[PDB]
Amino acid sequence: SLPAHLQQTFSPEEIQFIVENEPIKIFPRITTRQKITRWQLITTDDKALNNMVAMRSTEVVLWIALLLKQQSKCSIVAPQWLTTKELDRKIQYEKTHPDRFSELPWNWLVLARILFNKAKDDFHDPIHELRGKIQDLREIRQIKVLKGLKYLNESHLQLDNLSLLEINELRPFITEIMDKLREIHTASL
Amino acid sequence: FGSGNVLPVKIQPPLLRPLAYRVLSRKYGLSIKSDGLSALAEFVGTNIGANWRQGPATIKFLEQFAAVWKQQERGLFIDQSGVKEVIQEMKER
Amino acid sequence: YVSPQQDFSDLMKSWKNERCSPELLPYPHQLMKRLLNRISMQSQLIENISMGFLDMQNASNANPPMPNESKLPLLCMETELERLKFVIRSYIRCRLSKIDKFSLYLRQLNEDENSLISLTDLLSKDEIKYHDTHSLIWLKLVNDSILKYMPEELQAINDTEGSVNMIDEPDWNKFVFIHVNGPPDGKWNEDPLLQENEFGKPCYTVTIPDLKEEVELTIGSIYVMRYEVIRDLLRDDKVALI
Amino acid sequence: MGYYDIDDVLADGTEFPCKFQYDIPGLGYLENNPGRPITKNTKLSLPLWLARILAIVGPVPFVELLPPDMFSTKVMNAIKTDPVALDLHSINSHFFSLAIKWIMLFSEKELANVVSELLLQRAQELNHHASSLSIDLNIATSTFLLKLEEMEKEIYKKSHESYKDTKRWMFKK
Amino acid sequence: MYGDLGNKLVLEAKRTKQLYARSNQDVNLPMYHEDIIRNILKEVSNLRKNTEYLKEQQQLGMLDDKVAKCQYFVTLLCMERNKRCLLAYQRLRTDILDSMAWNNNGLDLMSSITFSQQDTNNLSHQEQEYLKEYCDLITDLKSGDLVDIDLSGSLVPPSDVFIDVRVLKDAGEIQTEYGVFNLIKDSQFFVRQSDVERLIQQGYLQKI
């Protein structure tokens, strides 16, 4: 809260927490179907976890999936946007329109890093190609952010599709610059 | 702290340490050493009759043991003196 | 209500709004009570299974809890409780710091008769005790240290008529990042504030009087905006601070 | 209007030129001349926490505030010609706070149009230098950070720290 | 002129703030400035004497009112400036003290075992008293309605269930809920994160 800044900005670890508080799909390697000890969770619905059958698709929260993959009882399926084809489509869309941001999920960087670190085996494409494509996208997004920073004023800004980490790393500069501009304008009234 | 019960049954600290841990280490205070834990078995076994399923008695005992360590400076680790502070507690009353 | 998932969603949204907002937001009295009761019951539950597993083991040198369908459930209980406790702790400490920053302003609000804002609603009881104790301690410190050697004309720690105002108030025009959720639940036709725009989804309208302009917020877009013009929408859950 | 702000307290203690419009005895320690009383039409440099109030109470006030040296036509022309290269630290270590103060006391729309542009054009260079995280395997940064106002150093430090934490979390192995 | 000394005090505060701002780990407050503060006290006392003298000299009616108003305003303004400087210095030092008091898991700080971050003699007596009541306030907060939640706990989110830790200082056997840890120096543990948060916070363990 108070120590180490934290007054008005989130740390990267808290952003990671928020990201891991989101659902994901898995392929269980165990069967916990009720016969013809139970999970009984208090913050997430446990219906899927209680009723599990092997070699079938279910969805749970992300951190439970990581805890299961720590053991040998899970296999997380990466989202469909984590593919070379779908990344090359977004790169082209990014190139063609130099005044809007492409539509990527608000956790693409954090999810990509977490999945590359933990579930390296589950990817179908080679991981180095995807890692290069992520950097290729990030550089162009940085160029567009740098160009858009010139239009700062006292009224309001619109950043339609900027990601969570990109917003977090830029908030202290943007807010303070516009605050100072607003004070300068208000003083002259 | 009271007397007149049936008899001091002897029990191993393994079945006593969870309550002491939750009361002391988690909330306020810490470092219940093994020798100190064994020392804290005798006085709680003095009135052992019909307990570990009872109500306030054990919690109040742990509260009173914490009272000395807030009052006196002492330290962190709990040693064979644990009976020495209960002597002070019975001196207080 | 009667959904444990929505309690966690509401707690998270309240925490996120609390960190990024300049003012001192109202306290969600009922949600905190429900969450504390749930934590109290859950801790007792895990303690009960732990005791039950331990007692049987020592009786007749029986086998430990058989590993399959045993360890993972209880481990999940523990880690889930740990995360929830962290979230509530961070929320409480952040609001306590904000209480520290605005002691005199809160006192002046409480002392004003014609003020709809009252500390019984905006402040929790433990926060009331904290405010009262901290104010007295700080007053004792300053009175013993400095203010005793000062003329009776200026011996007040709160002076609104001096050269510089000694009572600080929240910044009502701070710039924040917001996301336009839209209606809290649905029924887009029901909301009177929604108004359609050309070839687009319905957008809210706000006015900036100092600039004297009308700003339209389209649903699904992220904005950098003043805090005052968006207070009502945030209070009614139309927008969320990011 | 921050009572407990350290930087506001420091910036509020700067000396501004002013002229006495009355003739009064008993003063003189303002001039460091104890016994000598002050005369009429005398030009002295007084601190801002005093000159601000002495120019309000009288009608004609006791003291008139004179145009400052830091807001001359030369400084405005230098600001307009090249904002980035200008050394604001040499002009004054608290340029911006005194600028908003001067705009507040005397409503000047011209100064509000120049200071805003100066800040907007220097923000780009501030961001460029703050985003440049070194990689282990320049003279520009050292030269530029010696031309920064007291207020701009805080923004530079915040932006730099945020960028370093983001980079650290991204590449933690 | 009169307030020119107090500015120096404010300058000192700025330096302390930098040590607070550029602090990878917790730091200690420098020495108190009782001599400078006493100098401002002496000069404000002299200003009070001057205001009194002006009061009598005006109320005998030897001087014009417009003349006396100016020096009255000057003395009042100088006293206000000195009060502002002293209060700002005091509030900064108070904020740092509150931060340290929160960052030691409550406790009585200097009376009991401390993390050796601060020497006793740096703080003023009134500051030492203030710290004591603030610690008591933290203590009776922690026993409030929020007993289950540790309001003085760690503020970094939990994201690793099992961690590797290394012992820094030697110690004896310590009982934990359902087990025992033997703290032999230069030994490594693989255990759950929740058990060793307390010991890492107190410097008996390393790594995470």
Author numbering:
A (entry chain I): 2 to 37, 48 to 200
B (entry chain F): 2 to 94
C (entry chain D): 53 to 294
D (entry chain C): 1 to 58, 68 to 146, 159 to 194
E (entry chain H): 1 to 208
Recite the paper's sentences.
First, the MCM helicase is loaded onto duplex DNA as an inactive double hexamer. Activation occurs after the recruitment of a set of firing factors that assemble two Cdc45–MCM–GINS (CMG) holo-helicases. Here we use cryo-electron microscopy to image ATP-dependent CMG assembly on a chromatinized origin, reconstituted in vitro with purified yeast proteins. Our results explain how ATP binding nucleates origin DNA melting by the CMG and maintains replisome stability at initiation.
Structural analysis of the double-hexamer-to-dCMGE transition indicates that three sites (Mcm2>5, 5>3 and 3>7) exchange ADP for ATP, whereas Mcm7>4 remains ADP-bound. Mcm4>6, which is nucleotide-free in the double hexamer, is ADP-bound in the dCMGE complex, suggesting consecutive ATP binding and hydrolysis on the path to dCMGE formation. Although in the double hexamer, MCM engages in the same number of contacts with both the leading and the lagging strands, the vast majority of MCM interactions in the dCMGE involve the leading-strand template. The ATPase domains of Mcm3, Mcm5, Mcm2 and Mcm6 provide most of the leading-strand contacts, which explains how the double-hexamer-to-dCMGE transition leads to selection of the translocation strand. Captured between the ATPase and the N-terminal pore loops in the dCMGE complex, a stretch of seven base pairs is underwound. On the basis of the cryo-EM density of the untwisted lagging strand, three flipped-out bases can be confidently built, which are stabilized by two conserved residues (T423 and R424) located within the Mcm6-specific insertion of the N-terminal pore loop (ʻMcm6 wedge̓). Together, our data show that the double-hexamer-to-dCMGE transition not only promotes the untwisting of duplex DNA but also the disruption of at least three consecutive base pairs, with the resulting orphan bases being stabilized by an Mcm6 pore-loop element. Additional DNA contacts involve five conserved residues on Mcm2 that pull on the leading-strand template (V580, K582, P584 and W589 in h2i, as well as K633 in the pre-sensor 1 β-hairpin, PS1BH). These contacts are found in the dCMGE complex but are absent in the double hexamer and widen the minor groove, which decreases the superhelical DNA density. With the double-hexamer-to-dCMGE transition, a rigid-body rotation in the ATPase domains of Mcm4 and Mcm7 releases this latch, which creates enough space for the Mcm6 wedge insertion to disengage from the double hexamer interface and invade the helicase central channel.
